[PDB]
Amino acid sequence: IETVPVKLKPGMDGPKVKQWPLTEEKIKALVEICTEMEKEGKISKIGPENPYNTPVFAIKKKDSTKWRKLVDFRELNKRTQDFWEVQLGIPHPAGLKKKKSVTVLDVGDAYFSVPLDEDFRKYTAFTIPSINNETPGIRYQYNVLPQGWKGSPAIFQSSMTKILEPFKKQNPDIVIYQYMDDLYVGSDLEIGQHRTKIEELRQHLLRWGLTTPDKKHQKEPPFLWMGYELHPDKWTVQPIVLPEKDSWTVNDIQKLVGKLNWASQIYPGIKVRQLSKLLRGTKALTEVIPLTEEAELELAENREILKEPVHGVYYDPSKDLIAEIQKQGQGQWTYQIYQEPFKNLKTGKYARMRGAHTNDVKQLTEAVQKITTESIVIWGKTPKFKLPIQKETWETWWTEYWQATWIPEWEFVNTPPLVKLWYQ
Amino acid sequence: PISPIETVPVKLKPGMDGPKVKQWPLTEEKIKALVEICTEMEKEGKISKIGPENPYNTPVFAIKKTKWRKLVDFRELNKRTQDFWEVQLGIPHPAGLPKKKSVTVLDVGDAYFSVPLDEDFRKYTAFTIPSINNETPGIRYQYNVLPQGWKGSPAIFQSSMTKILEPFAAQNPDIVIYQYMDDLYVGSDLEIGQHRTKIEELRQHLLRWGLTTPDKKHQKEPPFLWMGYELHPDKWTVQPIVLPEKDSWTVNDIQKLVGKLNWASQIYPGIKVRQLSKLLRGTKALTEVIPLTEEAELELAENREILKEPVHGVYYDPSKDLIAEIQKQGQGQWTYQIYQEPFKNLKTGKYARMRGAHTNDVKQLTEAVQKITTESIVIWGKTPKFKLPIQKETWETWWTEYWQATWIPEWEFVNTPPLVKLWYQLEKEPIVGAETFYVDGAANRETKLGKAGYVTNKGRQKVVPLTNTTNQKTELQAIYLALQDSGLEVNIVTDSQYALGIIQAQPDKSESELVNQIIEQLIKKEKVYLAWVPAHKGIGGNEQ
């Protein structure tokens, strides 16, 4: 079938990125895998004349006992953006967040049969590193369309659209989105028949040559949740809560006034005047002080204005999406996705099982994956994260808990201030 | 030194061509002494004569070390050649080396000249030997093998070696061969008679490919001096470290001192560089003489006392566990040891905080554990068990209320002093029946004046005048006053998110003396609460 020509943006070179040191375990995985992968003609060994490199990590497939190779293709994506956005770019439907059930599938095993452009094969070069710098790593480049590259679904897009047609014909209430290796299927059906419809689609792709490893626990799951299933109808910007108290004290009112004054940046219609005068005299923090009529007026007013959506908040396709996660303790994490400050496109909170299962880094990682997934569902791309974690730590343990095929951009904040319970 | 080895295809940079640079210089005898070597290199087939038919050119000079050497100035080529895969940014660290019954060192001669060069490339590498005036046509040569100093020589030689060695280690995969540049290091568990057979076999294998090897046995006899190290058949250590004793110390000297100490800190435990690098904090002048401090002199003295006795480390044994233990040296400096058996250290190290003015002990411990984790993964490909001087209930309390998400692997308690503690905790909720100080502070940007004080609920007030301070420092000073003038239970209310954010982080030490004082005050108290209210909203605040 030959190849679609792939050119970088004029004035840009191929990716040169250092390779992270890896556990001997992960190295054995990336050796075995790449060995059989070489035997299947998917990849080949290169020479010293190929300066390019891209990172490679070893993860778990989903819950599986067998390993999985995860390439970080980011820097290549930044330099190929003309190919998979401008020219061959895949459109994102804005109505996927509208449906009540969205099931995600892994179609990434399709690209492995499609040949990659010969002149572009040198850019996909990756290195399997060794221990204690015994030798430089084992070099490989991609002969086929690589998983994780944004150009792969862009090329495969035609074939994909051809395969999904007999399915889209039978039920044109269903909207399907393709983001890289993932197929997001939206529906309005009942859960019971939704899962079955999904199985119809799965066997449809399965009989046309796309073998998706979404084969689940077969018949009887021991203890686990079958599908990966979201519900975007419950995804919206969450309101701010002013803690309800029978009797108010001085310090409670101080925290209240402070919080409201913070809320005055997103809501110009906030007045603390009637709450500022009640604290006028300098009293003890623990002294119990009842509210007045003016104060209650000012409370009931700002309780009403707080549950209204912010006026004039619109998504800008030119600007990047930016996410912030802050740690609330007790396995709960709060997050906001904004483009410009104080304009919050999406807000929410993520929590986990209570018991000894999960720890900090695990919770954070899973949180990142969740927020990213929601962002993909809504605006059609991944937000850049500001992460509340030490850089070298996250750079170490993030792969352990990462089950996703993609890797969103991130950076690490050492500050974050009094904003803790303000978002709680 | 001829080779039948497959060659790496090479291109120049895009939209670029071969170097053309003219060389006149210099002596009659340099010209004369170049020809003699050139003839031998031609006879050996390393180079070949050409008339133009354009060779381009490269500048060529001759140098003397009895035996002359040919030098080519290739700077105008390397800039024009394609980039290559980087080779080895670093060297294998002895701490992670498998211990073998015998180790043999073999260096190949004329390394780069023992591998061929791409045919459609060689034309760019050509040069001239100037005739002695008289406008006489030059002697044009070109390289048929990897030139010295060329941009691709190390990578290509290393690659060709990598491929050449492949149908050997297949025949005998009981022998371990470490590849480093021009050097090949072999080791094994075989019989001392069988080992010497395998080495001799490999030498012939390489010989059939055109690679020279030392004839007298195989060269260097242990111990080996390698990259500043000393490799004994049992133990390893660094090379002799000489710390100079001088009256005058420049920045150039301090850089060498810090270098040598940092280097020697991988095996010799307890080495402290914090105070000595504080002198290097002036980053500006290179040749300026820097006066030592009283702390730095003592630090160097301690380092000397450690550098009196020799001490050395052991090698790696996968069949045994990996253990790491950490000790605190108190100035923000930490030292750590990584061992298999208690009296045998693989290697040691040190970690000290630089970035940030405020940090506690638990966090620094976490960062130390972190560096040790990274280093461990790099060297041994795994992570160590941790022996740390901290109680579980201390740490568990720390990471639960800490805003960042940190992590530590499996670790067991160690009671060896000093232990890491939480010296104080700010109360989560305000204290009922405790005096409430409303503190504030202010300063003038120009005059650097301004004051710090408080007004309590009991009507008590105070103001202290302050010269030569900053707006923030007074905001800390007020909270200090509130701690001095209060009882054992005090509720403080401040408008400054600066001071609040600082104190809330619960530091046990800092650079600023004021903060040290505040910590001192916080330890003595029974219960401490610190709240926050918006400034200039006219609520309970101070106006001065």
Ligand SMILES: N#Cc1cc2c(Oc3ccccc3OCCn3ccc(=O)[nH]c3=O)cccn2c1
């Ligand atoms: N000149 C020098 C030199 C030798 C080596 C080196 O030798 C080894 C080769 C294979 C396996 C284990 C080895 O050494 C393990 C350590 N060791 C080193 C010397 C010795 O006698 N015994 C011993 O177990 C590896 C890396 C750098 N080198 C630099």
